[PDB]
């Protein structure tokens, strides 16, 4: 008279959990042959072949670089300039961004409607973006319109006209472009972080400028900016796709003949006004906003610094977690396991910015106002641990991830050409794929601790925060936790 093991609902719901678990016990050894969860370091030399990059310096100082792939049917060609927001004077602070929007509107040969129609009749595109140190103008076309595309970029950079009916109608496009980027809150955190870390230096200003500068800017200002900065040693013509190097050189030798001739380089302008880091903070409390956002940053490395590659391996150790991600509680990074297991944030991200003389290294996070204590403990605990205790599987995995993310990003004709043009401006050369992989795996566990002791250990920080941030710890709490009084 014991009940049989199918008679009660709770007894036969328990023989069905034991049968679900007996199919997790006999693994198939032919599905386990190549994959391994332990990271190793491997050699990628057989697959790293590429076409040749050919650089040619014209006698005025202009450089022309190409990577030809003659089996394609498209192309990308553009101009990279060594100028930006840093090289202005606070009475001309929005000028390099205003000049970007006023350069597709001029020309004595083709007006605004004619220029807009020549591009769309071909089926092409024409873009532009500004930053604090670099400007770009480039075009995506088909392979038979490359001489027409290069004809437009030379004429809109040399012979543009800026009339008053067009200037004043751009003052209301930009004054309404300001108002939308006052509501993205990741570009607002990172813009107050630059103004407090690099205060009283030219690197602390914003790109769009103050709103009083925009309603004052007139053509003269636009014309002295384009005669002081857009000069031949500070410009790179880069092309990629179905192009030929010797045919592009003869086109630019007769099209670019009339640009200015000032012999001031960019390095004479960085050296007479350098950038200096200051430990400080900004806090904007509102309490009607539901989520809080903040960033904490150390000073980092410049472009040509040999320690720059180790601050990119370290950024891949801190990692990234989001609430929609499929990794979940199982990620490699230990900062992402702390955030993920306890649910103490909405999202977390580590950043690393390089400049000509300085840089920034840190973490950005979004969270609910009752989680800010346990989140700030976990961020500071794992950054300071890089100066003390570094595992060997942590750096092998973070080297395999940085090798893969730098090359999976170069996919198509336009990622290739912005790789050529941006690297000739920062390093003076394009680094081949086999040297770049050789500098990455020369970063072992002892290299991590030595760069962490130079940049992180017992150093000043900069914080910018916004929202319901009354429970975020103060500056002395953060400054104290850059070292460990234990050991």
């Amino acid at each position: 008279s014991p009940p049989p093991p199918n008679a009660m609902v709770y007894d036969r719901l328990a023989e069905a959990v034991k049968a679900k678990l007996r199919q997790l016990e006999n693994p198939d050894p032919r599905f386990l042959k190549y994959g391994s969860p332990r990271p190793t370091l491997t050699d990628h030399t057989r697959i790293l072949a590429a076409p040749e990059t050919r650089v040619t310096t014209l006698p005025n100082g202009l450089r022309v670089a190409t990577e030809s792939s003659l089996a394609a049917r498209t192309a990308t060609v553009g101009v990279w300039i060594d100028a930006g927001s840093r090289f202005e004077t606070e009475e001309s602070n929005g000028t390099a961004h205003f000049l970007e929007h006023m350069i597709f509107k001029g020309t004595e040969k083709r007006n605004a409607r004619e220029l807009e129609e020549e591009i769309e009749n071909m089926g092409g595109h024409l873009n532009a973006y500004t930053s604090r140190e670099q400007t770009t103008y480039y075009a995506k076309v088909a392979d038979k319109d490359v001489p027409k595309a290069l004809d437009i970029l030379a004429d809109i950079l040399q012979n543009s006209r800026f009339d008053e009916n067009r200037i004043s109608r751009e003052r209301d496009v930009i004054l309404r472009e300001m108002e939308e980027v006052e509501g993205q809150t990741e570009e607002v955190i990172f813009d107050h972080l630059h103004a407090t870390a690099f205060q009283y230096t030219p690197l602390g200003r914003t790109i769009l400028g103050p709103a009083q500068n925009i309603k004052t800017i007139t053509k003269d200002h636009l014309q002295n900016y384009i005669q002081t900065h857009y000069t031949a040693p500070r410009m790179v013509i880069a092309a990629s796709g179905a192009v030929k190097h010797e045919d592009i050189v003869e086109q630019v030798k007769k099209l670019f003949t009339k640009l200015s001739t000032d012999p001031t380089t960019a390095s004479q302008l960085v050296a007479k006004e350098p950038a200096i880091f200051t430990g400080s903070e900004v806090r904007m409390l509102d309490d009607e906003i539901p989520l809080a956002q903040f960033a904490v940053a150390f000073e980092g490395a410049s472009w040509k610094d040999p320690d720059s590659i180790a601050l990119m391996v370290m950024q891949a150790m801190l990692g990234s977690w989001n609430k929609t991600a499929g990794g979940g509680k199982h990620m490699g990074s230990e900062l992402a396991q702390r955030v993920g297991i306890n649910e103490v944030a909405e999202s977390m991200m580590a950043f690393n910015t390089n400049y000509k003389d300085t840089g920034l290294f840190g973490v950005y996070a979004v969270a609910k106002p009752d989680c800010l204590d346990d989140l700030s403990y976990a961020i500071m605990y794992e950054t300071t641990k890089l100066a003390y205790r570094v595992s060997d599987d942590d750096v092998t995995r973070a080297r395999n991830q940085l090798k893969s993310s730098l090359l999976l990003y170069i996919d198509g004709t336009s990622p290739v050409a912005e790789d050529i043009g941006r690297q000739l401006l920062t390093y003076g050369r394009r680094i081949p794929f086999a040297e770049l992989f050789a500098r990455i795996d020369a970063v072992d566990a002892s290299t991590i601790k030595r760069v962490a002791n130079r940049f992180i250990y017992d150093k000043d920080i900069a914080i910018a925060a916004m929202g319901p941030i009354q429970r975020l710890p103060d500056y002395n709490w953060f400054r104290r936790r850059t070292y460990w009084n234990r050991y």
Binding site: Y388, R389, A445, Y487
Partner: peptide, 29 residues
């Protein structure tokens, strides 16, 4: 790493001997 953890941690054993005879001079032992 983990060696440097203990390669630190056994000299606080000895920072504590510079300290353990600092006031008492435990003599006979």
């Amino acid at each position: 790493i983990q060696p440097t953890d203990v390669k630190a941690a056994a000299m606080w054993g000895v920072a504590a001997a510079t300290g353990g005879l600092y006031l008492i001079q435990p003599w006979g032992w």
